[PDB]
Design a binder for this molecule. Structure first.
Ligand code: CYC
Ligand code: CYC
Ligand code: CYC
Ligand code: CYC
Ligand code: CYC
Ligand code: CYC
Ligand code: CYC
Ligand code: CYC
Lengths: 47, 160, 49, 50, 65, 159, 160, 159, 160, 159, 160, 160, 159
C-alpha cells in the first residue's frame, strides 16, 4: 500500500495505459493453416 | 553542378553577362523549386518502402533470387538493396539540383565496368530502376513524378 | 591488417585505449572529441579491428 | 599501461541564461510588455482586464 | 577478391608544387569490401575512373570468396 | 538551426557567412508561427495519441495479438507512452527548426534499442504516420505541411 | 593468458620443469574443458536474450530509464546494451580460458576512469552484471554457472 | 548554394537536413531580388569599369608610371578588361548566392598568376574596392549591401 | 548548444512540456536576435582590424615582442595573431548562439594545459582579450558590446 | 442550482427532496446546451457590446451629451466596459443556472454605487436591454428565450 | 459554493471569461452529477441505519460508552448520534456540490475548539467517521462511495 | 557573502561608487529582511519536526530503510538525519543572507565526491530535499517559502 | 553585520541566538537612513576630496615640500586619489553597518604598504580627519555622528 501512494513519476507507462484500453483492438486470431499441408515446394510461385 | 551553376557557367565561358534568357532559366528554376523541395521531402520519407515495393514488383519470385541467380546469396540481396537505394538517393539529388551532372559524376562514371566485371545482369537492373520510377511517380504525383522519372530514366539509359 | 599488429596493440590493451593507440599511428594524432570516440567504439563493437 | 585519455568529461557552463544581459533585459522588457494597454483592438475591452 | 583500377584525381583546391604524379594517375589493386569506399572517395574528388578489372575472384561463386 | 550554422562555420576558420545570417534572420521571423504550431500540438496531445493508437491497431493487429510485444494493458500503455515521447520530440523539432534536437534524443540509436526490446520498427513508423495524419487533420494546410515535415523525418528515420 | 599459459609461466620463471602439481593443474583443466566448451556454445546461442532479460530484471522501469537517469537518451540505452554485451562476451572468453587475466587486460584496465568521467552509475552497473550472472546461471546450469559467476563477479568486484 | 548543401549532406551519409531545406527555400524566395541586382549590374558595366579605372589610377599612379605593368594603351586596356572580368564574376556570385562559382574562376589560383605576370595584387584589390564603391553609388541601400557582400569577398580574396 | 537548445534540454530532462517561463526565455531570445545578427555582421566585417588594434593597444612595444619575450620569433607572432583571431571568432559564435557552451567545448577545454606546456604567458593573453573586448565594444556599440564582453570575459576567466 | 438547493435544504433540517433532485437532473441534461449558448456569447463579445451600446446612444443621447456622464472617449470606453462586465455576468448566470453569480458580483449594491458615481441607473438598464435584444437576434429562438430571460433578470434588478 | 461557482470565481479572479478549459471542467462536473444525484437518494434512504451500523461497529461496548466515558450519559449519547448524523448530511451536501469548502466553512470552523473545550475525544470521532465511510462505501457503490469518502476523510482530517 | 557584501563587491571591483541601482538592491534587501527574519525564526522553531515529516514523506517504508538499502544500519539512519538537518540549516543561513554563496562554499563544495565515494544514492537525497522544501513552504507560508525553496532547489540542483 | 553574526554563531554549534536576530532586525530598520547617508556622501565626493586636500596641505606642508612624497602634480593627484579611495571605503562601511568590508580592503595591511611607499601614515590619518570634518559640515547632526563613526574607525586604524 505504500508503493502505490507516493506518486507515479512523470513519463510513466501507466498514464497511457487508460488510452490503450479505450482504443481496444484485440489482435487477430490464428489463421489455422497447418505447416504440414502447405506443400511449400509447389506453393512458391515464380515471378 | 546545379541548374543555376550550369546557367552561370554557360554565361561565363562566353564572357557574357546575364542576359534575359539566362534570367528566364533561373526564374523557371525558382518557380519549380517549390514542388522540387516537396517531392524531395516525401521521397526522403519512405525510401525503404519504395525499394521494397520495387523489388516485390520486379525482382522477387524470379530466377534471380533462386539459386543460380545473382541475388541468391544473402550478401548479394543486401548489395542489391544498397544499389537500389543508391539509385533512388542520387536521383533525388539530381531532381533537387535540376541538373543530371551529379549522376554522371558520381553514379554513371564507372558503373558498366563494375557491372560487367561482377557479372551483374544489366537488364534486370534496368527493370528494377523502372519499377522504382513507377512506384515513386505513383507516390509523389504525376507533376513531380515526371522530373523524377527523367533522372531515373537517365540512370537507366546510361546503364544500358 | 596483419596479426602481428593485432598481437602488439590489440591484445594487451583494451577497447577504449586501442582507439587512441590506433589514431596515433595512422592519423598521427589523438581523437578530437567524444563523438569521434563513440563512432570508433561502435565500429569496434559490431565489427572487427 | 593506463589509458591516456579515457573519455571527455562534459563540463558545465557558469552562465546559463540569467546574464547575457539584453537577453535578460528582454525577459524583463517583454514580461512588462504584456501589461501596458496594448492598443490594437477597441478601448472598451482594454479597461476590463485585470 | 581484388580489383585492378586505373584512376585520376583532379587536385583542384591547391596548386601543389611538388612532384605529385603518382596520385593523379595510378594502377592499384584494392580488396573487395575496400573498393566500395575507394569508389566513393575517388568520386568525391571528381576523379575519372578509367577501367575496373578483375584481378582476384571468380564471379558468381558463393562460398570461399 | 543556429548551432548548425555555428558548427558549420566553426569547422572552417571563417566567420558566419552572411547568407547564413539571412537564414537565421528568416528563422527568427518564422519563429512565431513555429511557436503557435508547437502550442497547438502541445495542448491536444492525448487526442493525437488516441487517434494514433486507433489507426495503428486498426492497421497492424499483431501488437494486439499475444505473440506481439504490445499485448495486455501494461504493454499497450507503454506503446502509447512511446507515441507520446515521439510527439514530444516532434514538438521540440518544430520549435528548433532543424532536426538535430529530435534526432539526438529519438533517432540516433533507436534501431538497436527496438531490436533488443523485441518490437518491430515498422509498426513504430506506422504509428508516427498515424500521428502525422491526425495532426494533419488537426491543423491548417500551411501548419500541417510544416508539421508533416518533422513527422516525415521521424517516419523516414525509424525505417 | 590461459590456465595452461599461466601454469607454463609459473614453471618457467623458476626455471623449473613441469613437476607433478603442474601436470595435475593441466589435467584438471583438460577434465573441465568439456563443460567449458558446452557452456560457451550455449552462451553464444542467446546472448541477446540474456542481455534483454537482464535489463528487464534490473534496469527497466526504474528512474534510470526515466528522464534525468543515465539511460534516458536512446544512444545511452544503446551504449548500455553494448556495455552489457561486452561484459557477457569477455566473461565467456575468461570462462573458456580458465584464467581471468583477459578481463584484467581488456575490460578492467581503465574502466572506473571512464565510468567516473562520464558520470555512469557504478552500482546500477554492478546490479546489472549480477542480473546477467543470475540469468546465465539459470540458463547454463549450476555446474558451469559457478564458473561463469566467478568471472562476472570478478568484473563486478573490480568495477567497485 | 544548393551544391554547397548537397555536397555538405553528401559527405555525410544522411539526407539533406530540413534546416538546409529552409535555407534553400529562403534563397529561392530571394532569387528575384538577386536577379534584379544582377541585371542592374549587368546593363551598367562600362560605367563601373570607367569609374573603377578612374578611382584606381587616381589612387595608385604606378600602373600608369612606365615601371608599372599597366603602361600604355594596350596594357591599360588589359587592365580594364581584368576589371570587367571581376565584375562579371561578381554578377555570377550574386546570382548563385554563394561564392563558389566566383572563387572557382577568379580566386583559387590568382596569386601565382599575378605573381608570374608581374602585376601587384594590392592594386587589383583596390580596383575591386573602386568597383564596390561605384556599384554602391549605383544601387539602393539594400542592394548595395548585398552587392558589397560579394565585392567584399573578392577584395578579401585578392589580398 | 543554443539558448533554444538549452531551454529545450532543461525542459526535456524533467519530462516537462514547454511551460510559460521557457516560452519567455525563447521569446526574449527571439527579441534579442536582431542586434545579435547585426553585431555578428559588423564583427565579421573587420576582424583583422580589431586584432591589429588590440595588439597595438596591449602587446606591441613591450618586452613580449622584444627578444626573450614569447612573441619575438615571427612564427610566434603569427601564432599570436591566430590565437586572437580564434578568441574573437569563437566569441562571435557564442554571441550569436546566446550560450557559452561552445566556448567550453571548443576553446576552453584543454587550453590552460597547452599554454602551460608551451610557456605561453597567461596574463598577457588575458590583457590582449581585454583589449579585444574594449575595441569591439567601441566598434559595435554598448548594447551589443555588453554581450560580446560577456563571452570574451568568459574566455578570460576560464583562461585564468 | 446546486448551491441554492443545498442552502434551501439547509434552512430545513431535512435532506434534498426528490423534486429538487429532479431539478438537478434536468439542469445537468440542459447543461450542454447552456455551454453552447455560452460558447456563442463568448465568441460574439465585441459586436454584441458595440451594437448594444450604440443602440443605447441611439435611444438615450443624454449620456453622451456634454452635460452627461459618458462624455468623451475615455468615459464612453468605460461605458462599453460596463456593458462588457454585465454581458460576462449574464454568461455566468446562463452557465450556472442560478442568478447568485449575477447577484453577488454585480446586482446587490449597484444602486448606491451608481448614485455615488453620478451615473443614471435607467440608462445602464436600457443598455442591458439592448444587449438582450442583440443576443436574442444572434441565437436560436427558444435558446434566445433562455438567454434573454437571464438578461431580463439583470434588467429588472438594475432598475 | 459549488464546483461551478468555484470555476466562476477562479475565472473571475483572472478577469477572463469561461473558455474551453473551464467548459471542460463543467462538462466533467455534469457527467459525474448524474451518479451524484443517485447516490444522494440512496444515502438519504437509510441515513439512520448508516449511523446505527457505524456506532455499533465502532463506538459501542468500549470504555467511552461505559461509566467513566464521554458517551456514558443519555444526553451525551444523543449528541453523539446527532453529530454523526450531521457528518453524514454535510458530507452528502459536499458530495453534491462537488466542493468541500462549504463543508469546511459549515462545521470545521469551530468544531475543533468545541471538542477541545468540551473534552470530547478526537480519535474516537475519527474512528466513527471512518466507520461511516466504510458503511456508505459498502451501501452506495465504488466510485460514489469513494466520492463520499473524500469529503468524509476531509472532515476527519479537519478534526485532527 | 551577503547580498549587501555582493553588491559592495560588484561596486568595488569596478572602482565604482554606490550608484542608484546598487542602492535599489540594498533597499530591496532592507525591505525583505522583515519576512526573512520571521521565516528564519519559525524555521529554527521546529527543524526536527520538519526533518521527521520529510523522512516520513519520502524515505520511510521504502527499500532504502529495508536491508540492502543505504539507510538500513542505524548509524546510517542517524547520518541521514544529520545530512538533512545540515541541508535545512544551511538553507536557513542562505535565506537570511539572501545570497547562495555560503551553500557553494560550505555545502556544495565537495559533496558529490563524498556521495559517490560512499555510495549514497543521489536521487533519494534530491527527493528528500524536495520533501523538506514542501514541508517548510507549507509551514512558513508561500511568500517566504518561495525564497526557502530557491536555496533548497539550489542544493538539489548542485547535488545532481 | 549579518556575516559577523553568522560566523559568530557559526564558530559555535548553536544557531543564531534571537538577540542577534533583534540586532539584524534593527539594522534592517536603519538601512534606509544608511542608504541616504551613503548617497549624500556619494554625490558630493569631489567637494570632500577638495576640502580634505585643503585642510591637509594647510596642516602638513611637508608632502607639498620636495622632500615629502606628494611633491608635484602627479604625486599630489595620487594623494587625492588615495583620499578618494578612503572615502569610497567609508561609504561601503556606512552601507554594510559594520567595519569588516572596509577593513578588508583598506586597513588590514596598510602600514607595510605605506612604509614601503615612503609616505607617512600620520598624514593619511590627518587626511581622513579632514574628510570627517568636511562630511560633518556636509551632513546633519545625526548623519554626521553616524558618518564620523566609520571615519573615526579609519583614523584609529591608520594610526
Ligand atoms: C552510387 C553508384 C554505385 C553503384 C550502383 C555501386 C555498385 C556495386 N554493386 C556491387 C555488387 C552487387 N551489385 C548487385 C546488384 C544487382 N545484381 C542483380 O542481380 C540486380 C540486377 C542488381 C540489383 C538491383 C549484387 C547482387 C552485387 C553482389 C556481388 C557480390 O558482392 O558478390 C559492387 C561490388 C562491391 C560491393 O557491393 O560492396 C559495387 C561497387 N557502387 C556505386 O558506387
Ligand atoms: C570492454 C570493456 C569496455 C566498456 C564497459 C566500455 C564502456 C563505455 N561506455 C561508454 C558510455 C556509456 N556507458 C553507459 C552504460 C551504463 N550507464 C548506465 O546507466 C548503466 C548503469 C550502464 C549500462 C549497464 C551509458 C548509458 C553510456 C552513454 C554515455 C554517453 O555516450 O553519452 C563509453 C563512452 C563512448 C562510447 O560508448 O561509445 C565507453 C568507452 N568500453 C570498453 O572498452
Ligand atoms: C524519447 C526517447 C525514447 C524512446 C524511443 C524510448 C523507447 C522505449 N520503449 C520501451 C518499451 C516498449 N516499446 C514498445 C513499443 C511499441 N508498441 C508496439 O507494438 C510498436 C512496435 C511500438 C509503439 C507503437 C512496447 C510494446 C514496449 C514494452 C516492451 C517490453 O516490455 O518488453 C522501453 C522500455 C520500457 C520503458 O522504460 O519505457 C523504452 C526505454 N524510450 C525513450 O525514452
Ligand atoms: C576571369 C578570370 C581571369 C583573370 C583574373 C585573368 C587575368 C589576366 N591578366 C592578364 C594581364 C594583365 N593584367 C594586368 C592587371 C592589372 N593592371 C594593373 O596595374 C593592376 C595590377 C591590375 C588590374 C587593375 C596587366 C597590366 C596585364 C598585362 C600584363 C602583361 O602584358 O604582361 C592576363 C594575360 C593577358 C590576357 O590573356 O588577358 C590574364 C590571363 N584572366 C582571366 O581570365
Ligand atoms: C462587474 C460589475 C461592475 C460594474 C457594473 C462596474 C462599474 C464601474 N463603472 C465605472 C465608471 C463609469 N460607468 C459609466 C457608465 C455608464 N454610462 C452611462 O451613462 C450608462 C448608464 C452607463 C453604461 C452602462 C461611466 C460614464 C463611467 C465613468 C464615470 C467616471 O469616470 O467618473 C467605474 C469606475 C471606473 C472603473 O473602475 O472602471 C466602475 C468600477 N464595475 C464593476 O465591477
Ligand atoms: C452541524 C455542525 C455542528 C456540529 C458537528 C456540532 C457539534 C456539537 N457537539 C456538541 C457536544 C457533544 N459532542 C459529543 C460527541 C462525541 N462524543 C464522543 O465521545 C465522540 C468522540 C463524539 C461522538 C461521535 C458529546 C458527548 C457532546 C456532549 C458533551 C457534554 O455533555 O457536554 C456541542 C455542544 C452542545 C451540544 O450539542 O450539546 C456542539 C455545538 N455543532 C454544530 O453546529
Ligand atoms: C554540510 C554539508 C555536508 C554533508 C551533506 C556531509 C555528508 C556526509 N554524509 C556522510 C555519510 C552518510 N550520508 C548518508 C545520507 C544519505 N544516504 C541515503 O540513503 C539518503 C539518500 C541520504 C540521507 C538523506 C548516509 C546513510 C551515510 C552513512 C554512510 C556510513 O557512514 O556508513 C559522510 C561520511 C562520514 C559521516 O557522516 O560522519 C559525510 C561527510 N558532510 C557535510 O559537511
Ligand atoms: C583602496 C585601498 C588602496 C590604498 C590604501 C592604496 C594606496 C596606494 N598609494 C599609492 C601611492 C601614493 N600614496 C601617496 C599618499 C599620500 N600623500 C601623502 O603625502 C599622504 C601621506 C598620503 C595621502 C594624503 C603618495 C604621495 C603616493 C605616490 C608615492 C609614489 O609615487 O612613490 C599607491 C601606488 C600607486 C598606485 O598604484 O596608486 C597605492 C597602491 N591603493 C589602494 O588600492
Amino acid at each position: 500500500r505504500k508503493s502505490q501512494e507516493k506518486q507515479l513519476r512523470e513519463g510513466d507507462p501507466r498514464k497511457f495505459a487508460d488510452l490503450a484500453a479505450s482504443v481496444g483492438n484485440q489482435g487477430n486470431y490464428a489463421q489455422r493453416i497447418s505447416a504440414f499441408d502447405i506443400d511449400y515446394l509447389n506453393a512458391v510461385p515464380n515471378r | 553542378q546545379d541548374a543555376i551553376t550550369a546557367v552561370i557557367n554557360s554565361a561565363d565561358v562566353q564572357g557574357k553577362y546575364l542576359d534575359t534568357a539566362a534570367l528566364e532559366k533561373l526564374k523557371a528554376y525558382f518557380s519549380t523549386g517549390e514542388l522540387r523541395v516537396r517531392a524531395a521531402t516525401t521521397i526522403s520519407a519512405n525510401a525503404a518502402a519504395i525499394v521494397k515495393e520495387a523489388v516485390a514488383k520486379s525482382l522477387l519470385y524470379s530466377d534471380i533470387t533462386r539459386p543460380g541467380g545473382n541475388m541468391y546469396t544473402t550478401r548479394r540481396y543486401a548489395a542489391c538493396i544498397r544499389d537500389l537505394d543508391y539509385y533512388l538517393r542520387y536521383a533525388t539529388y539530381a531532381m533537387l539540383a535540376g541538373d543530371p551532372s551529379i549522376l554522371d559524376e558520381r553514379v554513371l562514371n564507372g558503373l558498366k565496368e563494375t557491372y560487367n566485371s561482377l557479372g551483374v545482369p544489366v537488364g534486370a537492373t534496368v527493370q528494377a530502376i523502372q519499377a522504382i520510377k513507377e512506384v515513386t511517380a505513383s507516390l509523389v504525383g504525376a507533376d513531380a513524378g515526371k522530373e523524377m522519372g527523367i533522372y531515373l530514366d537517365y540512370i537507366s539509359s546510361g546503364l544500358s | 591488417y596483419s596479426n602481428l599488429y593485432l598481437k602488439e596493440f590489440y591484445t594487451p590493451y583494451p577497447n577504449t585505449k586501442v582507439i587512441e593507440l590506433g589514431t596515433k599511428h595512422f592519423l598521427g594524432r589523438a581523437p578530437i572529441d567524444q563523438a569521434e570516440i563513440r563512432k570508433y567504439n561502435q565500429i569496434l563493437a559490431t565489427q572487427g579491428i | 599501461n593506463d589509458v591516456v585519455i579515457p573519455s571527455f568529461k562534459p563540463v558545465q557552463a557558469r552562465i546559463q541564461s540569467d546574464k547575457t544581459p539584453i537577453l535578460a533585459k528582454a525577459i524583463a522588457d517583454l514580461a512588462a510588455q504584456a501589461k501596458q494597454m496594448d492598443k490594437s483592438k477597441p478601448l472598451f475591452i482594454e479597461l476590463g482586464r485585470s | 577478391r581484388l580489383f585492378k583500377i586505373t584512376a585520376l584525381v583532379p587536385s583542384l583546391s591547391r596548386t601543389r608544387t611538388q612532384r605529385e604524379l603518382q596520385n593523379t594517375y595510378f594502377t592499384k589493386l584494392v580488396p573487395y569490401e575496400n573498393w566500395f569506399r575507394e569508389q566513393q572517395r575517388i568520386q568525391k574528388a571528381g576523379g575519372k575512373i578509367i577501367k575496373v578489372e578483375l584481378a582476384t575472384g571468380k564471379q558468381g561463386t558463393n562460398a570461399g570468396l | 538551426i543556429v548551432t548548425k550554422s555555428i558548427v558549420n562555420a566553426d569547422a572552417e576558420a571563417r566567420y558566419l557567412s552572411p547568407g547564413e545570417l539571412d537564414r537565421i534572420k528568416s528563422f527568427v521571423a518564422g519563429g512565431q508561427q513555429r511557436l503557435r504550431i508547437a502550442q497547438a500540438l502541445t495542448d491536444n496531445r492525448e487526442r493525437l495519441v488516441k487517434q494514433a493508437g486507433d489507426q495503428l491497431f486498426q492497421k497492424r493487429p499483431d501488437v494486439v495479438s499475444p505473440g506481439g510485444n504490445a499485448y495486455g494493458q501494461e504493454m499497450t500503455a507503454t506503446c502509447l507512452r512511446d507515441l507520446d515521447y515521439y510527439l514530444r520530440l516532434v514538438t521540440y523539432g518544430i520549435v528548433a527548426g532543424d532536426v538535430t534536437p529530435i534526432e539526438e534524443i529519438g533517432v540516433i540509436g533507436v534501431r538497436e534499442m527496438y531490436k533488443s526490446l523485441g518490437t518491430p520498427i515498422e509498426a513504430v513508423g506506422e504509428g508516427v504516420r498515424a500521428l502525422k495524419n491526425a495532426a494533419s487533420t488537426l491543423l491548417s494546410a500551411e501548419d500541417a505541411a510544416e508539421a508533416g515535415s518533422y513527422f516525415d523525418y521521424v517516419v523516414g528515420a525509424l525505417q
